[PDB]
Structure 1
Amino acid sequence: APKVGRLIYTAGGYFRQSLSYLEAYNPSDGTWLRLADLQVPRSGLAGCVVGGLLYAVGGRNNSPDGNTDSSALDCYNPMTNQWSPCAPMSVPRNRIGVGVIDGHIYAVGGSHGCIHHNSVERYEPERDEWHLVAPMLTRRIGVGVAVLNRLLYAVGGFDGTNRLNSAECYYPERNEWRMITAMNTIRSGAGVCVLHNCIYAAGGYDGQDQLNSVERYDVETETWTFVAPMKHRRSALGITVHQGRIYVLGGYDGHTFLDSVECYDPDTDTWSEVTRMTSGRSGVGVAVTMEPC
């Protein structure tokens, strides 16, 4: 699984307005590279990687003139430093969550104006087609999504009335969603990822304050356990895993748009500041793939 020359890509984001940046961080030497801008600015999107290609999914273009929720799927090839449009999703999805099962991209929840989706759809890259699958049991915007052992988890979010501590799991062979144990803490816009045999939920927003607490769901024991908290409270953060460590990027803490990137080491249960982004921003999409050539 580990290979040399992989970077942490951050796409889009929000600061005053939705952003077009694509920038890549190299943990091996601490450098940032600025790459090809997104064709359309977008915040509240999600990123993922299939077959060494980076995908930017959903979001919203919050611009000086208006707010346009995105149904777009766009693909970045590091070999060419170019974005290519793909088939669009069935519906615009801002504040989206995304996960990949066996090379297929799942787009989960999100908002379209005042509409809060429980719908879910699945993208087939070779066929360039989206199709709807079973909807979630709960409408979730700002939902955290991660895949472990070819099961897809949807964690927290906002249903239009309450921020959520609930979570649920999608079982592909049954096309069926089931509730799992609820988190200890209500979290909207948390960073959600997979590390070892646990689903981590870092930070988020409870309608009052941004959070620095982090908790992980053990898919075997079905319990949520707090780990060491992040140094900086944040919601609408980006998150990814690289070489056995969690990286959180940016977000909003109620006072500033963070540029800080923290790295969690599960062997020592400690966070450390590893770098800063080129500028503070929230609502980014993040994924890991090979460096451009």
Structure 2
Amino acid sequence: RQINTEYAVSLLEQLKLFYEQQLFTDIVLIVEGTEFPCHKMVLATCSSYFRAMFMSGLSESKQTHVHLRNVDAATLQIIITYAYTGNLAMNDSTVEQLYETACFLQVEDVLQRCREYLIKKINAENCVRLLSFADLFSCEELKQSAKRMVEHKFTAVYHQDAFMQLSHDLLIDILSSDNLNVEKEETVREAAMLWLEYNTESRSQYLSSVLSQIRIDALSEVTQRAWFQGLPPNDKSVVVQGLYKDMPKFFKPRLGMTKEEMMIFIEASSENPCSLYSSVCYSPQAEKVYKLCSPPADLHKVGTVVTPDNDIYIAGGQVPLKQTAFRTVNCFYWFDAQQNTWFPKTPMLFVRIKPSLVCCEGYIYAIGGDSVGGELNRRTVERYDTEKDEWTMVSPLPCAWQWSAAVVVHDCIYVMTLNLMYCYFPRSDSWVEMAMRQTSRSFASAAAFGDKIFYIGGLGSSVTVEIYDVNKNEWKMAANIPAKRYSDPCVRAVVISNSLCVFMRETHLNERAKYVTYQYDLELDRWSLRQHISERVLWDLGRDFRCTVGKLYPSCLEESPWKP
């Protein structure tokens, strides 16, 4: 266990009193002309450098004035007070110098805290800076976790200025890695070319190594004469060298070109009765069913969103409290497309049940979702910031709605309910009244294809389809999906292969559920049979399962072993 806490607090606050009131100070730190009167005890408890500074036997053992150099006054003051009061106020700016002084003074505890701060602060705009920082100081855990987030993010942006100022060893590890996420192998080629041409002949010796990590499908085509233009004059040790050099190193395709348009399913019927629900996916091209990681702490009643950058997020949901037992939590998670795991993120402010997650302008919008408040503003609409990793409230929606769906069209949020629709204008944070539907239908989903909204189904569900045009602002009927009579189809609207397809599972009387998808002809207003899902690969999923459009890697994921 521990020891007496009531005296632990008394001594702690009294040492703080003896620090603010400078009485029992035998050693003072001289940093850039700033006096830091303190004790040898407190500096010893935190830092592992002062233990080699005082109890070492050097000249400073008896000297009462030490001139600590290559440090910062603010960083020293916060470190000293942290050793004195433990309140480590970590902002978003001074953490860089905080780690520098923590490593210099070898203070293990603050090193772990700032590493825990940086493991949460890793994002898009500082991935390169943190990796270089993680390369400068040995922080392998941060270095590896950065590298993974770095690997995906460089491929996406590949335009940050700190990428040019990187060590040769770091670049070789980044480029030769098999975790890059690229639609083509040519974007990494030009990224290396611009990095090599960024500086003078100091990149010439590294050019013999950077090309040794890139595949040979581009080491004989264009971007070889371009280097000859940029070659130092009369250098005959490079042009001939690269002429006969690209024989070895085993051309092999990378892993980033292995993303296929797949239908991600959540809360599917668990195969083993020991678990409540599971998550699976259907492959429209591979015609197989790949398993997915379980929702975080079997998070049920959640919502899914896929950003244009192909990122999966989970918000809302409830966990069974420790027979009916369920408690709602506002936890937020992010799915790793390669590690097959859900990385936790900043939680929301209010708990939600079945929230509608919609992405727009890089912000994740969660509209409604049976909030816990229940006050006059029983909607609690709030967006998420993907660069600052925080949540910001938005303009409340006019009318309280339940069991609603939302889509994004023309950089605007379009949320749909039983019969009403309101469009949110993110630039002014306002809501405008939209067209009114003539049919009262709920418990349905909508897919945003182009500049039109397709509300498919509604109430089991039915085959009613009401097409809404943003430019026309009107709801019109197109047709009804031809399905077997005396059945209860489960419609799922989704956009795939630049076309509006439907994932409709139908069940007949005294018969098992049948899976089949149809391709809706936009100009002909007819659902055509695109593909029939055989039951030998896909089993029953349930009723409360959700579907979304996204891309996943079949290599990182594993096939689900289950009998037809």
Separation of aligned partners in 2, 1:110 and 1:125: 21
In structure 1, the residue matched to 2:409 is: 148
Name stretches of at least 5 consecutive residues in structure 1 with no aligned partner: 157-163
In structure 1, the residue matched to 2:480 is: 229
Matches within 5 A, 1:102-251: 102-112=361-371, 115=374, 117-156=378-417, 164-205=418-459, 210-230=461-481, 231=483, 233=488, 238-243=492-497, 244-248=499-503
Report the AA paired with residue 306 of structure 2. Answer: V
Contact 1:18 1:43 in 2 (8 A): no
Residues 27 and 102 (structure 1 numbering): CA distance in 2 closer, same or farther, change over 3 Å? same
**Per residue, is there more helix in 1 or in 2?**
2
Q: Which string of whole-angstrom CA distances, capped at 9 and with x for unpartnered residues, describes residues 149-206 of structure 1?
A: 11111101xxxxxxx211111010010111211122222221111112211111122x
Alignment partner of 2:354 out of 83, 86, 95: 95
In structure 2, the residue matched to 1:65 is: 324
For the pair 1:49 / 2:306, whether they are aligned, the reply is yes
Separation of aligned partners in 1, 2:398 and 2:291: 40
Q: Which string of whole-angstrom CA distances, capped at 9 and with x for unpartnered residues, describes residues 93-130 of structure 1?
A: 21322211022110001214694942211011232211
Q: Which string of whole-angstrom CA distances, capped at 9 and with x for unpartnered residues, describes residues 46-95 of structure 1?
A: 21123332112223447853132342322111211111112122212213
SS at match of 1:111: coil
Residues 110 and 38 (structure 1 numbering): CA distance in 2 closer, same or farther, change over 3 Å? same
Residues 43 and 200 (structure 1 numbering): CA distance in 2 closer, same or farther, change over 3 Å? farther
Matched residues, percent identical?
20
Structure 1 position 271, deviation (Å): 5.3
Name stretches of at least 5 consecutive residues in structure 2 with no aligned partner: 1-182, 184-256, 557-564
Residues 128 and 256 (structure 1 numbering): CA distance in 2 closer, same or farther, change over 3 Å? farther
Contact 2:269 2:278 in 1 (8 A): no
Separation of aligned partners in 2, 1:279 and 1:7: 18
Which of 1 and 2 has greater Rg?
2
Matches within 5 A, 1:248-287: 248=503, 260=515, 262-267=517-522, 268=524, 269-270=526-527, 272=529, 274-275=532-533, 277-287=538-548
CA-atom RMSD, angstroms?
A: 3.3
Separation of aligned partners in 2, 1:258 and 1:70: 33
Deviating more after overlay: 53-62 vs 92-101: 53-62
Residues 102 and 188 (structure 1 numbering): CA distance in 2 closer, same or farther, change over 3 Å? same
Q: Which string of whole-angstrom CA distances, capped at 9 and with x for unpartnered residues, describes residues 177-236 of structure 1?
A: 11211122222221111112211111122xxx533212111011111122333436557x
Separation of aligned partners in 2, 1:60 and 1:249: 27
Residues 262 and 147 (structure 1 numbering): CA distance in 2 closer, same or farther, change over 3 Å? same
Between the two structures, name the one with larger relative contact order (CA 8 Å, sep ≥ 6): 1
**Per residue, is there more strand in 1 or in 2?**
1
Separation of aligned partners in 2, 1:170 and 1:91: 21
Report the AA paired with residue 224 of structure 1. Answer: W
Q: Which runs of 4+ in 1 moved over 4 A?
A: 13-20, 61-64, 113-116, 232-235, 249-253, 255-259
Alignment partner of 2:345 out of 86, 94, 116: 86
Separation of aligned partners in 2, 1:41 and 1:180: 38
TM-score by length of 1: 0.82
Contact 1:123 1:130 in 2 (8 A): yes
Separation of aligned partners in 2, 1:76 and 1:87: 14
